[PDB]
Design a protein around this nucleic acid. Structure first.
Ligand SMILES: [K+]
Ligand SMILES: [K+]
Ligand SMILES: [K+]
Ligand SMILES: [K+]
Ligand SMILES: [K+]
Ligand SMILES: [K+]
Ligand SMILES: [K+]
Ligand SMILES: [K+]
Ligand SMILES: [Mg+2]
Ligand SMILES: [Mg+2]
Ligand SMILES: [Mg+2]
Ligand SMILES: [Mg+2]
Ligand SMILES: [Mg+2]
Ligand SMILES: [Mg+2]
Ligand SMILES: [Mg+2]
Ligand SMILES: [Mg+2]
Ligand SMILES: [Mg+2]
Ligand SMILES: [Mg+2]
Ligand SMILES: [Zn+2]
Lengths: 43, 102, 141, 136, 55, 142, 61, 194, 74
RNA sequence: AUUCCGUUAACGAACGAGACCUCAGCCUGCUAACUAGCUAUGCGGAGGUAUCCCUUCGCGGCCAGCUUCUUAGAGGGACUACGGCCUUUUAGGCCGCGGAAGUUUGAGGCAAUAACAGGUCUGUGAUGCCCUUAGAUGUUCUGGGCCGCACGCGCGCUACACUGAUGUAUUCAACGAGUUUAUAGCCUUGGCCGACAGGCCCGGGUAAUCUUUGAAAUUUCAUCGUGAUGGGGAUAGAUCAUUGCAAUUGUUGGUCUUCAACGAGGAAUUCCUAGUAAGCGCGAGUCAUCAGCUCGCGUUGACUACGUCCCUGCCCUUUGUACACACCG
């Protein structure tokens, strides 16, 4: 399934019927937060 | 050979519209015809409010633009030929004339 | 020839018209007796022109009141103003000017709004704020 | 003495009682399960809500003879709460109004107006006037 | 491009289906009364169109 | 009738849930998970329980009637659209699940979503909003 | 606790003009006049209840 | 004596009511001679000129003050109903004229002296100053209404009962009234900061 | 603070106290009864209705948001 | 008000201000209304003594009359006109009767000289220069993103409840907007189906002709009873409809169910002087579908002051300067 950059590989299971193919190919990388940069506070 | 001829006058200029209405009324009266009106409908005020700036900077100031349309209704109890002859009189620009029956 | 007058009271956008003619002394608004006018709290304002003058002066006139526009309070204020003006005009045009002046004086001594419309009107709102004078909250940082 | 000369609340109560006593009304099986409109949070508190609504609607048709299902939905609608969003006007259930109108027509209190909507019949005027007179 | 591909995306609605009749820009289009003019163009041509500033 | 009877019971147990006896029946039955005000109203109406009585005035038999009404909505003509578990994923039946059954169903749905690596299941696992709400500014707790 | 009637208003007083300096003549003694500072609107002919009449008012600014 | 046919709510009389305070007599409109009204709703224009609001009926001023806080703004019919119920309760409890009770409450609530901020540049200095009769009446009304609202908030007791109790306890210097306590506190502060 | 433990149903002692002293109150309202007898507002309203039916009290003026009742006889 | 009275090496002038124009406020005076109404009559229904009489509704009269109510053109009206005080016999000011109106009647539009390296090249087939110009920084198609969430800030919506929530009954606005007719496109009346969401069928309106017979707060009667409670509605599950070619990262809208913080908010800080603040809703812009936003509208309707330069700033004059990139010197 194309996610805008790559074709994520999946195998269809009986429990995924009636669902969209988009639901199994995440289009974004989950966010892991680094230390805040300059300008995050003192606003 | 008598019918209720409906005359609708539409213009943006109140002076020109009123002058045309008065001319039509006097022309109808000169022919001993029965004249009902003019009936002045509520003025139609087309309003547009747009931001003055061509961009998003500065205090949000708005320009209120209005276009006023004035409508008049005149009813004549006479024949098509006579109403046509009356309406043949010169009409200044900006005034729209519509003649119908009922 | 019919003996009648028609007088209008105003308050904001509320317009009330009282048709007062010769009769046995009934008073109805939109076909409903004035005693059932709503809200019940404003019945005092509705009846003030009647309480000040007495029912005897109204005993010889039938009044039909038609109201439109405005809100609950404005309609009642227009109703009372129209009632007062209609009674004054009827007394002027069918009753001695002395009695007309007396009723006008008693009404005005209690309240001038019973015969003079309040000219207050809603102020147009200006851009840059929610209200006519209220402006959007200002922030500097 | 007519309807216009009596308090609307007392007349509504009296006419609802009269309609219930008549026994000609055929309440739908769902009267005890539905709200009076999508804007409501709970079903009507009073078990006689159907009869009260029928009486109020009959009075409305008696006063004006050109009302329809949409008109009654607007009449009995009101503000709808949207949680954290501001309130807006909302219409009421149309099925209840349609069924009440059909029942009233069956009882002959109202009939179809040629211009559309419903109109009060002579029998309906007579019945409402007698109820108003007997209120005293 | 291929006929079935080139400009094949439907444009029956949305901002991309409308443009200013004066400048062709697709933004800030005034559709009231059928003007179909962007706000800047309308502000420029209001006097010619017949829109007067009274207040 | 204004005087409390000797059989008035202050605290009641229904599906292992404490029900206040001082509260009216309609709003006291709502203490059970899966039962709201609307469903309590309909259960009381179908069970013929007088709504003006308190949760302590009525009888254990009336409580049992309320519970059977809750457990068999179809038998009492309660429409399908009024139930909180309509068209079940596995059984495909319509019922009103309450108490621990509601928690079991919620867990089953969440685990089913997570197992297939569904986007909603992943959002639930990560503890983020699952209904498209913006998260830049709101929902800040940890 | 005495009562005094304002005879004339000298005028606004305070950094922001909050008070008004006035001259008040005592009702009990009509030949005694005292200077007072008043908070709130006040005009000639008003009557003020002085809890104590010993102090003399001075300009606050 | 002056006799007026006008009845407040068609139930109460403006006869036999007299203001017993020369200081604030001219700024209270609760007498049969000073334009009595049937209801505290008249929709007049009292802010046009200085001191004009003094002509407004005192009951009307109480009703207007009762509409504080955003949720109650503009709900004058409800305020008038609250005033009517409070006046009825006052009559029931005290057997006197409720208008007289209100007048006495205002008179006893009005503070006589205050402390005004003096100086500048972050200096906390105060000087004792007198209070004009109009400001005294305004403060009396504000304190009575604030006490009634505070008592009614988060309490089964209804606003009408709270207002009636406040007016009854203010008509006499019982010291149980919130307005009386606030007036005493203000006077104490002024005495301290003389 | 401590929550008020108002009772939704009368006990024999409280009911007797209501029947005894309530007729002698100058002002009777649901709030007054709730504060004095320590009863809920609903029970206070029911007690007011019961007393009115018994005729021991009279209605000074009734409103949806306010009910004012007093002793029938001085 | 650099508005005037005057003083005067100044005299005459030109911009700004004012005048001006738009809306609102008064006209029982003028003109005209079957695309707006009123009055009385004729007929009919209902009620009351049921014929005649009284009350209330429905329909016709282009030869029943009329313009108070509605609409919109021309005009009138206020000029501080009049009375009392203060002020230079001035310019003017305060109060007051009358008056629709006595703050410039209220609110707006328009708005001088000289400037900012303030914003806009992402409004423009406005534009110089620079870059690219076919494996394109042109154009189009597919998909994704602009919305991504340990965190900080701004404008806001909903609340913390009984001056209340819920359920009945009750009934008062204004500014506005609406179609290609194709089976039909936009506003949609009426009838039927349905609990709702929605669906089907007759039709009206290119519009004072139809939607429009057109809101909420509020009023009234009951339930609730100080309990984070029948306050609050965040979060989440199941399921059903509509728009769209496409709804998943829920487009939006319904039913049941779950029922978070929040018990009035520190330092700080915003707007506001009368139909104003605040509350309440409605129309339009965006719009195939989405308004917690903006622009307008009306409804209920206040407290306080009508004073000052204390803070923050502005105008004029005098005065000091080692400032002129002008004290962020
Ligand atoms: K977050
Ligand atoms: K309370
Ligand atoms: K360029
Ligand atoms: K543009
Ligand atoms: K200053
Ligand atoms: K200046
Ligand atoms: K120096
Ligand atoms: K210099
Ligand atoms: Mg529950
Ligand atoms: Mg006219
Ligand atoms: Mg720059
Ligand atoms: Mg963005
Ligand atoms: Mg803003
Ligand atoms: Mg209406
Ligand atoms: Mg709760
Ligand atoms: Mg709630
Ligand atoms: Mg500031
Ligand atoms: Mg926007
Ligand atoms: Zn353009």
């Amino acid at each position: 399934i194309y996610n805008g950059k790559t074709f994520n590989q999946i195998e269809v299971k009986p429990e995924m019927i009636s669902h969209y193919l988009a639901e199994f190919s995440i289009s974004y990388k989950p966010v892991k937060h680094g230390r805040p940069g300059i300008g995050a506070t003192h606003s | 050979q008598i019918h209720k001829i409906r005359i609708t006058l539409s213009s943006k200029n109140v002076k020109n519209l009123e002058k045309v209405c008065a001319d039509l009324v006097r022309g109808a009266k000169d022919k001993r015809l029965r004249v009902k009106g003019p009936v002045r409908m509520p003025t139609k005020v087309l309003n547009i409010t747009t931001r003055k700036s061509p961009c998003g900077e500065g205090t949000n100031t708005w320009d209120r633009f209005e276009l006023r349309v004035h409508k008049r209704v005149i009813d004549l109890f006479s024949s098509a030929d006579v109403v046509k002859q009356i309406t043949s009189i010169t009409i200044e620009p900006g005034v729209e004339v519509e003649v119908t029956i009922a | 020839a019919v003996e009648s007058v028609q007088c209008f009271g105003r308050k904001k956008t509320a317009v009330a018209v009282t048709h007062c003619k010769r009769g046995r002394g009934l008073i109805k608004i939109n076909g409903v007796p004035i005693e059932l006018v709503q809200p019940e709290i404003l019945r005092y304002k509705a009846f003030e022109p009647i309480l000040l003058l007495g029912r005897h002066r109204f005993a010889g006139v039938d009044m039909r009141i038609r109201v439109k526009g405005g809100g609950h309070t404005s309609q009642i204020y227009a109703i009372r103003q129209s009632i007062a003006k209609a009674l004054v005009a009827f007394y002027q045009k069918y009753v001695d000017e002395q009695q007309k002046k007396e009723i006008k004086d008693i009404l005005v001594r209690y309240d001038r709004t019973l015969l003079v419309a309040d000219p207050r009107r809603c102020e147009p709102k200006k851009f840059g704020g929610r209200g006519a004078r209220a402006r959007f909250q200002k922030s500097y940082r | 003495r007519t309807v216009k000369d009596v308090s609307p609340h007392e007349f509504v109560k009296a006419y609802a009682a009269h309609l219930k006593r008549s026994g000609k009304m055929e309440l739908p099986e769902w009267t005890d399960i539905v709200k009076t409109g999508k804007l409501k949070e709970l079903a009507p508190y009073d078990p006689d809500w159907y009869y009260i609504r029928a009486a109020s609607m009959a009075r409305k048709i008696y006063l004006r003879g050109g009302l329809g299902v949409g008109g009654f939905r607007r009449i009995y609608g009101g503000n709808q709460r949207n949680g954290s969003r501001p309130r807006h006007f909302c219409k009421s259930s149309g099925s209840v109004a349609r069924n009440i109108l059909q029942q009233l027509q069956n009882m002959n209190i109202v009939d179809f107006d040629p211009k559309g909507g419903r109109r009060i019949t002579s029998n309906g005027q007579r019945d409402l006037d007698q109820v108003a007179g007997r209120i005293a | 491009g291929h006929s079935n591909i080139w400009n094949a995306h439907p444009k029956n609605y949305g901002p991309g289906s409308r443009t200013c009749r004066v400048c062709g820009n697709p933004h800030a289009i005034i559709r009231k009364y059928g003007l179909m003019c962007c706000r800047q163009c309308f502000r420029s041509n209001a006097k010619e169109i017949g829109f007067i500033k009274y207040r | 009738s204004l005087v409390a009877n000797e059989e008035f019971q202050h605290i009641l147990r229904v599906q292992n849930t404490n029900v206040d006896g001082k509260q009216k029946i309609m709003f006291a039955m709502t203490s059970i998970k899966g039962i709201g005000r609307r469903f309590a109203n309909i259960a009381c109406k179908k069970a013929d329980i007088d709504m003006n009585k308190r949760a302590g005035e009525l009888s254990a038999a009336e409580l049992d009637s309320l519970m059977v009404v809750v457990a068999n909505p179809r038998q009492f003509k309660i429409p399908d659209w009024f139930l909180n578990r309509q068209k079940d994923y596995k059984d495909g039946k319509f019922s009103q699940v309450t108490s621990n059954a509601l928690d079991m169903k919620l867990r089953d749905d969440l685990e089913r979503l997570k197992k297939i690596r569904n986007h909603r299941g992943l959002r639930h696992y990560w503890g983020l909003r699952v209904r498209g709400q913006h998260t830049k500014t709101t929902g800040r707790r940890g | 606790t005495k009562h005094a009637i304002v005879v004339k208003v000298m005028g606004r007083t305070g950094s922001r003009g909050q008070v008004t300096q006035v001259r008040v003549k005592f009702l009990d003694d009509q030949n005694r006049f005292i200077m007072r500072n008043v908070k709130g609107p006040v005009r000639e002919g008003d009557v003020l209840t002085l809890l104590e009449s010993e102090r003399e008012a001075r300009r606050l600014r | 004596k002056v006799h007026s046919d006008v009845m407040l709510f068609n139930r109460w009389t403006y006869d036999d009511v007299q203001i017993n305070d020369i200081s604030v007599e001219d700024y209270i409109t609760a007498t049969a001679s000073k334009h009595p009204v049937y209801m505290p709703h008249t929709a007049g224009r009292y802010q046009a000129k200085r001191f004009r609001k003094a002509q407004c009926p005192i009951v009307e001023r109480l009703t207007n003050s009762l509409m504080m806080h955003g949720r109650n703004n503009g709900k004058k019919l409800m305020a008038v109903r609250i005033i009517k119920h409070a006046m009825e309760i006052i009559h029931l409890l005290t057997d006197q004229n409720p208008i007289q009770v209100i007048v006495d409450a205002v008179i006893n609530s009005g503070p006589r002296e205050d402390a005004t901020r003096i100086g500048s540049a972050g200096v906390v200095r105060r000087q004792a100053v007198d209070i004009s009769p109009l400001r005294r009446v305004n403060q009396a009304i504000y304190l009575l209404t604030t006490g009634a609202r505070e008592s009614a908030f988060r309490n089964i007791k209804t606003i009408a009962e709270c207002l009636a109790d406040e007016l009854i306890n203010a008509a006499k210097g019982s010291s149980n009234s919130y307005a009386i306590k606030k007036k005493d506190e203000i006077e104490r502060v002024a005495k301290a900061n003389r | 603070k401590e929550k008020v433990n108002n009772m939704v149903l009368f006990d024999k002692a409280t009911y007797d106290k209501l029947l005894s002293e309530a007729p002698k109150y100058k002002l009777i309202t649901p709030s007054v009864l709730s504060d004095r007898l320590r009863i809920s507002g609903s029970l206070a309203r029911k007690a007011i209705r019961d007393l009115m039916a018994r005729g021991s009290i009279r209605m000074v003026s009734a409103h949806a948001s306010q009910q004012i009742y007093t002793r029938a006889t001085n």
